[PDB]
Amino acid sequence: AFQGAMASSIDISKINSWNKEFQSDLTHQLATTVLKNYNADDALLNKTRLQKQDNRVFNTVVSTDSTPVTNQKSSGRAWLFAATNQLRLNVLSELNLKEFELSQAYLFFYDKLEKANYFLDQIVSSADQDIDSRLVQYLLAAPTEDGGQYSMFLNLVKKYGLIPKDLYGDLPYSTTASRKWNSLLTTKLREFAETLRTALKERSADDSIIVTLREQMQREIFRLMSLFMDIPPVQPNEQFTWEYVDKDKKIHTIKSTPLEFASKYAKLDPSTPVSLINDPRHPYGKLIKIDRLGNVLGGDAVIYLNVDNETLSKLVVKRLQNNKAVFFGSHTPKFMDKKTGVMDIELWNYPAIGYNLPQQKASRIRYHESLMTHAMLITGCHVDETSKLPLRYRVENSWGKDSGKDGLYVMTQKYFEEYCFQIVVDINELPKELASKFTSGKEEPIVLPIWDPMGALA
Amino acid sequence: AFQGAMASSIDISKINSWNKEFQSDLTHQLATTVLKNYNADDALLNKTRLQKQDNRVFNTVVSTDSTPVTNQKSSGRAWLFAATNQLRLNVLSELNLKEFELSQAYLFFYDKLEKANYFLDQIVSSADQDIDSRLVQYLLAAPTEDGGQYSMFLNLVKKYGLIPKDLYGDLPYSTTASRKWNSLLTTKLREFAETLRTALKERSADDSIIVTLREQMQREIFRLMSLFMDIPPVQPNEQFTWEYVDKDKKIHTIKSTPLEFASKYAKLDPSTPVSLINDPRHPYGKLIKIDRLGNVLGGDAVIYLNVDNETLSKLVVKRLQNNKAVFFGSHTPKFMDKKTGVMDIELWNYPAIGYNLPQQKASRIRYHESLMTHAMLITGCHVDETSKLPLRYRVENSWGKDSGKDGLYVMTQKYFEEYCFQIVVDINELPKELASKFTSGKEEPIVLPIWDPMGALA
Amino acid sequence: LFFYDKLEKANYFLDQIVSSADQDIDSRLVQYLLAAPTEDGGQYSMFLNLVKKYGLIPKDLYGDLPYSTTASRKWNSLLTTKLREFAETLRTALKERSADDSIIVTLREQMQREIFRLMSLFMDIPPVQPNEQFTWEYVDKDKKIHTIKSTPLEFASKYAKLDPSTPVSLINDPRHPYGKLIKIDRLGNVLGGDAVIYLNVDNETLSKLVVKRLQNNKAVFFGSHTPKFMDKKTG
């Protein structure tokens, strides 16, 4: 015990001796001088590399421009923005509009209301477990967080449809600075969780007292939501009229319902999108399910089909060639230079200070180093003339026109392979052997915990 | 010829081969990455060194504080500020004042008028030389420049005295942004120079036409000066009354003249100050004279007594122990960190990028690398307990309270030895063998050109 | 062009020092050489000198990324301090030896290497050599992608349309007779390159040439006394 603990301790002579040796090295002397003065990323950004990688020529792009660049501001709504950014191109194109956005706020309101409701159910169903359990504590950590998955986006569209941002936008303070609202709701939900668990010690979930309690809680949650944002102006099957001007300055009027608008104008058929992921911790060709992660009670689960990078990459190119943008999930902001808008794992000269990272992808995920954190949209790529393989991708972010280069980012193929994980394509775009995994029946998914790194995107 | 020129040319293969070799070196790889991102001084500032050198404890200081810190702003008046900063301590002390300044603007007005006049005389006296000559071209380069030497400061005080800044301060735009005024005057003086030389081709300098011409030029120069600053409110032997409040809030009134004020209150006896310099290009113990450099026609010349650093340094300490601050000239801003206010030749880690400078002091001066550029004031120093030698000096700059640390700088002994050159002390402070050089008679000074690096201070 | 101009000027300075080693350190010429050896400014003849040796390339391949391209003062100071040290070393070695001496030849090579070493810390040597091919991808006004494979030297002629043997500088310098050529002694960058030469003409001629060039659809490079009588806010 003693000898071991002594050997494993920090010895003052040892570190001072190592210091003397390091100081004899000129690269070290230069590095410590520079790194005490500037942030490592600022100090190490490699302009020799930047000069070559910052390349905005893309020979494979979607025909419609992303106008205007969107901005989620201080909220974790990237999944909603990226999903709607893929669809708005259909509208911009079909209707010949200069600028257009589907309402991100519309989906945000319902997502939050549904998540708060979903939490009550999750608490009721896990009431048998101790308050200190990993699951119960995880449920209580961030019940109304903004982030989400593509399955949760479809869950919302199926119930609520889509509407032009013109009818309901980011006017409220809480759409662009959601933290306080989330805190207020969450404090209340944590109180509610205790009230339910307490009533459930004695009673059954189907008991009238519990049924009543939950109704009262739903009402209070809705009451508090409505103080920070208004319930959308039309119900899902209710008609709205939208007046707009096209590129030729011609006025048009559309009368539709949110549910009809999603199909008819946004062109979304909820039964076609499927998510593919490169999660090397698991065998390829297997479906992966994230237990519990959701928003609408009883809605679809988060499911991904695990495939290799060659397949993921080939699907992205084919989708772009088919004139459709690609929703993707990645580890933002790892190796991302926000000022130039370049995503390149070699853009900073870390090897020059002897900082090298051998840990492979599957292990980075397992060891808490890398996870999906943000959703963006691939709108173009450059396929090398000689290799017929993609070298870089054009990425539409939702951080406003000042982020990156006019709101757009350029990502290397290597970045895509290492720090990106999920893409969303339509099932008919898949080779029949991959499509089968979804339509087959009895492809038993590998079930991961609700807290898995391959989760929600903000 | 050919082979030599070829050998002395830049060869593309050679530089690309050297590039390949340099890139194999890790220190080089790190250096080029960092140096393409930040200014070298910002990148290389050594905080390990800063931590030790930025030391404001001084065991040897003058008794009176420099209140308030002065600011020359965008003008080259440092010589005037430093000279008056040494004297104002006498007034602050004697009169028990919280804050006080002698008028820097007062001296500035007369200095500029005198220099413009001095230029006309210099042109008349060198009319025998070609317009393209080194002297004539040098005279035409900056006839009304702000900078000056200590002898020029005394020349002004002897003729004009000194007055409280309360009677005449930096109100005019041109006192704090003198460039335009200087340009306007200089353009006119360049016209005048041609007019005089032209009239002198035919006539003698003592000719009535020339005498008249010069009078008309003086009048026009004064006319233009008076548009940018007012002539001081009282003549040198004219009485003024100055009302002020002391530290105990007591009101006092002083009636004096600028000439009496300089002696009586500022305590300046113009016959006592002498400049010593460490100019290793010349033998020590020799007087050095800068040919022509001056302001008042027929005034004293710039003369320095050349001595070694041990002597220069011993004189600074003794003067501070005698409770007097020390005017000094140095090469600002070589090795000066304006943000922290530290003057240290090792504060930046240039050796880490293999940038070393073996050129010695005398050679730096000869080779156009180092010269006197700015005047400041030593107000304290720290004499090492063990060595009984100074380690650092407390320097009062005239760049406002925001420069350095509350307007003050700390300078190492090595900085003083290498990038400082001149100090001003009183003749009675000198060993009789050094004092003799001045009072002796027939110590023939080494005469240097008007453009010598050991010149005016701005 | 900036990278090569500075490297060439630093090299040119060493040669200027070696050739004027017979003069006193305090001389007007030697002091002038030591004042600003790596200054940024230059003449049109120095621009052609560079293009003839190095060609031209799209900014897309090498732009103003480095700090020193847009704030060159510090870099210039650092190089200049070193060059001033080198000047003394050469003059000292030359007191004893002849310029063609092996010691001097070697010394200069070592100095060139150190100058290049220091240059490369602040900017990278361009990505392609003058006769080396590069590929440049770009998008035209119709959003069409194109790829050009060329060399800097071929690009200067083929795409930039510069034939270095055609440009000449005319000047209105009334200190001298019109119709006379004026040469500025020594001013240059590339050792042994063309000298700065101007043909002195009157304003009526200068002005008539500017109009005719514009009518021929070509812009006109000109030198003037900035910012005399220039209002920067209104332009």
From Swiss-Prot, chain C:
Keywords annotated in UniProt: Cytoplasm, DNA-binding, Hydrolase, Mitochondrion, Protease, Thiol protease, Transit peptide
Keyword Zinc: no
Coiled-coil segments on the chain, per record: none
GO MF, any single term: cysteine-type aminopeptidase activity
UniProt PTM comment: The N-terminus of isoform Cytoplasmic is blocked.
Biological processes per GO annotation: homocysteine catabolic process; negative regulation of transcription by RNA polymerase II; proteolysis; response to antibiotic; response to toxic substance
Recorded superkingdom: Eukaryota
Cellular component terms (Gene Ontology): cytoplasm; mitochondrion
Protein family (similarity comment): Belongs to the peptidase C1 family.
Function: The normal physiological role of the enzyme is unknown, but it is not essential for the viability of yeast cells. Has aminopeptidase activity, shortening substrate peptides sequentially by 1 amino acid. Has bleomycin hydrolase activity, which can protect the cell from the toxic effects of bleomycin. Has homocysteine-thiolactonase activity, protecting the cell against homocysteine toxicity. Acts as a repressor in the GAL4 regulatory system, but this does not require either the peptidase or nucleic acid-binding activities.
Other remarks in the entry: Present with 521 molecules/cell in log phase SD medium.
Subunit comment: Homohexamer. Binds to nucleic acids. Binds single-stranded DNA and RNA with higher affinity than double-stranded DNA.
Protein name in the entry: Cysteine proteinase 1, mitochondrial
